[PDB]
């Protein structure tokens with residue numbers, strides 16, 4: 102109920118280092134693909150944790 | 152034998168680390184992929200090198 | 201062995217099949233039937249029906 | 251207990267549902283409403299909307 106949002110802006114995002122931080126199976130993406138997160142690039146990232 | 156993170160990379164039309172530099176499948180691939188856990192055999196307390 | 205479930209070793213076997221016009225060297229367990237001609241039958245010649 | 255993850259026992263329950271071709275007996279938790287006629291309404295008769 103009190104989930105935390107982290108605001109990510111003005112940096113270089115490397116998504117291949119996320120796999121070394123947690124032992125998860127699926128990087129379940131919806132609008133995009135997990136293998137194409139480095140070629141295209143975004144505006145703002147928000148990370149919700151619970 | 153891979154790490155459990157890169158099981159999704161053994162598929163046609165994939166990029167990453169295994170699919171880019173280690174083991175690449177063709178785009179017109181016809182076949183099957185079988186992957187199973189081997190924690191009992193390939194894991195050691197000192198570290199399997 | 202103390203790692204998370206996404207860092208465990210995984211044994212992978214990939215079975216790739218040649219689907220070509222070559223004669224079938226290896227294929228599966230079917231019993232063969234005697235050939236009859238000039239009669240409306242259902243044929244199964246090396247896996248393909250008709 | 252020493253078998254692998256593919257050779258563990260699994261308990262399976264299959265719920266077989268048969269649809270609205272008979273008078274309904276199994277219903278979800280919903281509250282009924284008084285029936286009003288000769289008016290443009292949004293009805294819900296045994297799970298089908300309109």
Ligand SMILES: *[C@@H]1O[C@H](CO)[C@@H](O)[C@H](O)[C@H]1NC(C)=O
Pocket residue numbers: 121122123
């Ligand atoms: C998280 O941070 C702590 C200390 O800051 C460190 O010991 C730990 O290894 C970090 N986690 C990962 C997955 O690297």
